[PDB]
């Protein structure tokens, strides 16, 4: 669970990603927007990205995809893009922020 940073805020995540991260580095943190949920924060060129993960009945929901555990979700997005740009750029989770 090297990627789980706990209750770090969105701002703290932005700073940490920019100070210590390279593109593809990411963290999972508690959501500041809803109590039992999470955010995936990803270092990306120009502007970092934040994705919602909603925990419902022990299932981790992101977009229209569902995962048994946060680990499964994270591993999925190392192998399938978590974001795709208009110019064909596919962004993947690569590594927990160090």
């Amino acid at each position: 669970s090297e990627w789980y940073y706990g209750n770090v805020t969105r701002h703290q995540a932005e700073c940490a990603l920019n100070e210590r991260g390279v593109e593809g580095d990411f963290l999972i943190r508690d959501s500041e927007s809803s109590p039992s949920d999470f955010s995936v924060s990803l270092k990306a060129s120009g502007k970092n990205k934040h994705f919602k993960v909603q925990l419902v009945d022990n299932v981790y929901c992101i977009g229209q995809r569902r995962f048994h555990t946060m680990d499964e979700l994270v591993e999925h997005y190392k192998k399938a893009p978590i974001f795709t740009s208009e110019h064909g750029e596919k962004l993947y989770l690569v590594r927990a922020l160090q």
Binding site: R10, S33, H50, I62, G63, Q64, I82, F83, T84, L91
Partner: peptide, 8 residues
Amino acid sequence: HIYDEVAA
């Protein structure tokens, strides 16, 4: 806070 759209 605004969140980014996850890729399908």
